Symmetry: C5
Subunit: 206 residues, 5 copies
């Protein structure tokens, strides 16, 4: 306990706050989704509710330490409020995202962070035909709201969404689920913005 107390004191109390990524010092956030459930569908408003967790990985030099100097500590769990986190935002959401898990990140000696918030999202999705064989396809872009590609780039480990925790007695079955890097442009800003497009094909069980 005593060695970790020193480490956290040395990293946070002394040091000034990391101001976020820049053009000169850009960052790459790795994103991956695990789908737990499609909970609800609203055919009158075209809203659909997903329950999932979103694995986020990035790396900062300012969070580095030498394990010999702090009793062989290679990593620690700390509150997400203590560190900077990327502003990863669903682009077609219809409600504020509901937080389902503790906001605690794992920081490792090399400066790499792992942060996995569990979320419930309501987003825009036409569910007409969900009760047929073909099913329906819906998409939602996840990316930084304010940082362009020149400050925050994104990537995935795999293009396949993790469905090994998907609820087996859900009212919907997943036919496919993919997560793909995209480049988009918007009216505000001349520079490109990056997102991870979550494309989920699904239908009712029988």
């Amino acid at each position: 306990q005593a060695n970790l107390m020193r480490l956290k004191s040395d990293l946070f109390n002394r040091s000034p706050m990391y101001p976020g990524p820049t053009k000169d010092d850009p960052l790459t956030v790795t994103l991956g989704f695990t789908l737990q459930d499609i909970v609800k569908v609203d055919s009158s408003t075209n809203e659909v509710d997903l329950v999932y967790y979103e694995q986020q990985r990035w790396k900062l030099n300012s969070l580095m330490w030498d394990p010999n100097e702090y009793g062989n500590i290679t990593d620690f769990r700390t509150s997400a409020a203590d560190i900077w986190t990327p502003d990863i935002t669903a682009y077609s959401s219809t409600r504020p995202v509901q937080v389902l898990s503790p906001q605690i990140a794992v920081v490792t000696h090399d400066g790499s962070v792992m942060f996995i918030p569990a979320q419930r999202l309501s987003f825009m999705c036409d569910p007409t035909g969900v009760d047929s064989e073909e099913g329906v396809t819906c998409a939602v872009k996840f990316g930084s709201w304010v940082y362009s590609g020149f400050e925050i780039d994104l990537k995935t480990d795999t293009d396949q969404v993790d469905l090994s925790s998907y609820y087996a007695s859900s009212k919907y079955e997943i036919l496919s689920a993919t997560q793909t890097r995209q480049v988009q442009h918007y009216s505000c800003c001349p520079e490109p913005y990056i997102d991870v497009n979550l494309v989920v094909k699904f239908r009712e069980r029988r």
Copy 2:
């Protein structure tokens, strides 16, 4: 990072807080909307729900810096709580506005700020006739709640609402969507208050 850390420290912690606009130092805020979706309509309460994001823009001398002095940093991203934001409020809302995006702005070396919050708004609107060819028109005014035209004026870069991000499989389609400056008066106060009137015509697809 080191030069930006300095810049943020020199702007916020070093200085006293900007008290907001006055009649002596008036401010002009540019507004623009991009309508993403008309999510819901309630014919029994005359409430309609919009999802959009609102491009806000203003300029303060107190947020200026010489980029030469801070490693050629022309601009930076920062939390909206670190700076003064204008109090742009919907005048015919029926619920608290639900925030859908990060509250983070972009500040540039000349003092100019850009801030684009995503919002869900429930507002007063009669949807009777939306299931027809002619459809229904509806309006909501966005302006400062507490500052008059002598302290905060508004303008638009375009009268046309950006519909390029409108949900293609929405239950309603937009026939027209405009954003226009207005001048209004209210009982409390003798001086004129300014707003941008968002007028949307729509029907069932």
Copy 3:
């Protein structure tokens, strides 16, 4: 900018915080309502939902200043958290009040304040007969929760509720709307408590 920062620092940072009204130093608060909309009715729970804003006026010696000392500043806007605000509560509410506007007040050189929060309220009201010619009448008392008539007194500038911003295409029309000072006694306490009673008569249009 410079003289207003000074003024706010001299009023707020310098002084110890105003502890509120007392029997020795009492305070009168003027209330006026402007009704925007009767949004919803619920005949299964006897709840009705209003949307209004509520003009609150009062005056403190501790908020006085001389404009000649601070560059001829006669008034300013500031956050409601920077000052004491009266604890004006609806006595028959069924849900927590939903705030629809920024919490920013206006303060004038003579120590007077103006604060006008927009609110959505769910309150106790039986709407049985709203669909008839005669309509229904309902009432809600607005007053301090903890201060008596010896500390906080209330009055109205007019007994007529302002209906000039009422929603023209509402599901309900207003037949009458009044705001009247009352004196009430309660079981806890020996001393009288003051309220303004909002009485509204309405029907389906």
Copy 4:
């Protein structure tokens, strides 16, 4: 203003906070409910929604002062954050409590406190037979969540619930309503816990 400012600073800023009651220094809290409305019933989930306020009363030596030393001030209103308050909880709630009033207590020179928060509670109650002449009976225990009888005891001035502010046009009329001290035991702990059982008889009118 000056004498109250001194008093509050001497009570609060001067001393370290009260750490709650102990076995050595026990504390008795007087509870009393005034029932305003039975708002809703759900026969499919057996939940019932009450709106009420709750008169809490206790006495601390550390809140004592001599009125001669502070300009004859016998009492004052102060924010409930500034003092310790008892953790009185409903033992069969099905939703978080919704706060309907400001959180302000009245403190008196002999160390006694009066705190009366207004609340909406959803709690467990089978409403089958509410549409008959006999109606239904439903109970809810109010007590400390963490303090036993050795640290917090309870009592009532009267066992008759205050119905003088009950809503006359409610969906349900109250036949009777009692509030009675009780001792209980739980699995965690060997020591007795105290509650006031709020028993309410009602029916549709």
Copy 5:
């Protein structure tokens, strides 16, 4: 009062806060559930709502004291925000957990802690068949969200869920309710994570 004030000051004001467990200094948290009510069942979305409280227990050396040094004080109540608490999370929830009790822990002189928050939980569960005699079985895992078995182990004092405070007039009755330790692996991480699997069998009475 004076002796507890010293104790809390020596434990909390002096010390830097406990930084959670590590691989080199692991921690065992004992969990126990008491089910009060199955409030709601939703057969269209396969969500079910439980009301319960969750007895948590653990022991830190940093929370130890000698009772002879602080006037024979063997234990005390204090806010959960003053100390570290485990991040015990329901793994198959569909809404944010709703807190129904005060967040107050009981600390004892040997370093042991007892913390019993009451919660309402919406979790994934197919209720189809609940109206039969066989009923339905449903399960939810409770474990740390971020700490593995190397940092946080779990256990139970009994395999049986406490049903002695289960609501007698609930729409559903409990056929069996158990709480069992399990080991799991997840895609992120090579190391094993511990949970207590709450398995509840139930039907309509």
